[PDB]
Swiss-Prot record, chains A, B, C, D:
InterPro entries: GFP (IPR009017), GFP-related (IPR011584). Contains a chromophore consisting of modified amino acid residues. The chromophore is formed by autocatalytic backbone condensation between Xaa-N and Gly-(N+2), and oxidation of Tyr-(N+1) to didehydrotyrosine. Maturation of the chromophore requires nothing other than molecular oxygen. The precise stereochemistry of the tyrosine has not been determined. Tentacle and oral disk. Signal peptide: none annotated. Transmembrane segments: none annotated. Pigment protein that is yellow-green in color. Belongs to the GFP family. Gene3D superfamilies: Green fluorescent protein. This is GFP-like fluorescent chromoprotein FP506.
Amino acid sequence: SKHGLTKEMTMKYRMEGCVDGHKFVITGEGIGYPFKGKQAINLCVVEGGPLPFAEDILSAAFNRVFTEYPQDIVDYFKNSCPAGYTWDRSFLFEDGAVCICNADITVSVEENCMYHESKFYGVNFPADGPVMKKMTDNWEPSCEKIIPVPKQGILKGDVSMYLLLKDGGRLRCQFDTVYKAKSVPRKMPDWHFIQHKLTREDRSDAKNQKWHLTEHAIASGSALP
Amino acid sequence: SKHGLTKEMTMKYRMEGCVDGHKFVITGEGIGYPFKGKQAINLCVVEGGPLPFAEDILSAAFNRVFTEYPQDIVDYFKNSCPAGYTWDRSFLFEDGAVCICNADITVSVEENCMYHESKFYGVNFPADGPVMKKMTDNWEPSCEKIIPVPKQGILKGDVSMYLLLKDGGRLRCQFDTVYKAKSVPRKMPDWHFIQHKLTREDRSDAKNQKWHLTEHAIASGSALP
Amino acid sequence: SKHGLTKEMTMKYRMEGCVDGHKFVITGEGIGYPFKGKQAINLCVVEGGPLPFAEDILSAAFNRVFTEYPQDIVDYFKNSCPAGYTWDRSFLFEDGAVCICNADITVSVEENCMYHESKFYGVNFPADGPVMKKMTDNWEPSCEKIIPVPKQGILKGDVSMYLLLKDGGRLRCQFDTVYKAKSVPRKMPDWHFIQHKLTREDRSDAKNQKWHLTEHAIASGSALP
Amino acid sequence: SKHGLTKEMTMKYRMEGCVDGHKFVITGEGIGYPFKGKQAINLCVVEGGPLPFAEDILSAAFNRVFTEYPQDIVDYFKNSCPAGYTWDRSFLFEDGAVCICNADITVSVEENCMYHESKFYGVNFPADGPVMKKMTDNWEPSCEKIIPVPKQGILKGDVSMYLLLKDGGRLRCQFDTVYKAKSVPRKMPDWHFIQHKLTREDRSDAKNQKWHLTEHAIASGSALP
């Protein structure tokens, strides 16, 4: 219980959202390894299923506590535990679609469990584009830049994301994030990178829309001396 | 009761929202003149007041039924009444802030009353910018382009907005809107312009954050023969 | 010779440019009516023809002297004559392509002739998009907002343009312009609109790529009292 | 003379350009180490000096031949030598300024020398922003994503750049690049990253505006297995 965290934890999720008028509620449960930056989770659509849009748009909405940090970069995210942190992100897709997500991350030390409460809102997905036609095929691995805002004790993230398409295409999406510990820390990192790789697998059956998501993320500094 | 509408109507509002973690609920009541494109309303912050951000960001979120349409342009908005229409908009401010709003417009013919239910979400307003410092001073009058999407029986709006600043500055914001009648009409307009002018006046006292908003809007076609 | 201008003038053009590595020089001659805001011109590709891209991208590059101004809005452009004005514009297409153009406008009072020297540079047009496939079909009429920068005695223009496609599509392009009289005037307009309508007709034969362009433009203030 | 390249080479530059009406010509000479991804060069303003804008805007305009590639990623850039490659880039600054640059890279094997010919065009830098006030302080190290376009045998680059400000600020700039070998190769890389670090030092005296630039760049694949 280094910040209320252990090497292997469980996770619970609740998301509420609305994309172009369609409302939904998703719940999920998972297992993660904070110090390795690995998590695996299972989502279940509990109201508003089947979703009219690609599951993939929600991937990055479903916790930077799961990042591998080297000893020599301040870990803002684990340092905020157990009370945790919140974040707010915009998604700017290349075809005009725009999303906002918010989450609240909190630890129950007694249950050894991370709690995740999020809101997802999206507008203006083209009726005929690959999101609404469900023709996407996962996000490409990425490199996010994390930038301290020292007067405020918050972080920004900047990542140019590429949603891969079933037909061999790619659809660009610009992510801009604000990360806020519930207590603004005296101890802040320098700017650094976080690299991410996701997987996603639909496991839907006749009763429920369900899928399985994975992330592996590792922090680092610049490769140049 | 041309589409359930009269020359002078009353209006009720409820908005729920969240801007950078701060949640709020606003209610409002007003009087409008659908055929002149004029409305005047009074808002009252009912949870989460005082707001930490400029009232002005919510102005365009608080009904295209109030637009003056010439006989010779199809009025998509009045034609959708009484059941009404919904819209979804993104706000892209020049300093990185991003908002989404949604509203649902409906007529009660018996009460001669327009009902307005909206959601407003905003992220990434700079702590030190004029929105969070409440240094704005109304939107400049504008010209919006309205564009039919004929295969879908919906409209898009495109307007480059300028929020005027107390210090003499201007802050650009890009509005992209989707307008959707609850029944997709066979009768659709050609592309046209809608010009808008707003006013806003804080009328806050010690019990409640309150203000007064006005819009005057007129549709037209291109000035060139 | 109100500012060296007459009711009917002739015009000469020279453009040099480079779009994704392809260099070109175009010359042109035309007739215009400054006080009616009308001009008609003929372009001839003189080096680098046939062009690999749609003629339409160059339309707005080929003089705000040809705008109809009401008595009650300062005419920055005619006021700058005969020495004239320069402008610098960015074109941001929705598919990632980016252009810059520059022009220099000057009057020869003895010849009753407007001289136009421009540079056009474009990058990153998709090999398979409608510009490089020459599947465009003129720009839609528009409304440009003109905004004074009073400390500097220059103007900005902001117009969201739509290039119409042969297949019934539309391709958005964002125009941001800086307009600079060669002497910064004491007399400046308030913000206003300029509406534009263009036509274009290829008149290419076996010796030369040639086409005919027209603009009709009219300034106005807000429609709302 | 692996592709006409040696471990240590010399470099010559000529740039012509125009930023908001101000024309310039810069020449330069340098020493580089293609296999280590290191170069050091000296620029001299030869027409239009002193420049009215920050030297820093031209840094990335002044050769991906100087990148360290691991054996296991195809080196598109060295593979294009000696004939070389060209590139076209847009710069989208957060305050509205827009630049385009083009370069042509070629090797003289007899002289053991890389030749660099470039064009730089910029519009709409705010008169009062840090570029025109010359208040910038170098670019932050970055990570560029390099993406193959297989049907075309070209590469794209995508990097979100941050120009550091003397006052402790940062000014964002979005770089989108197209890289084109003069012969489209059968052998293409997979997507990868290139990390960059620059330095810049003014060495201006009374006769000439002069400065010294350095780059160190290294290619890599994703950190996640």
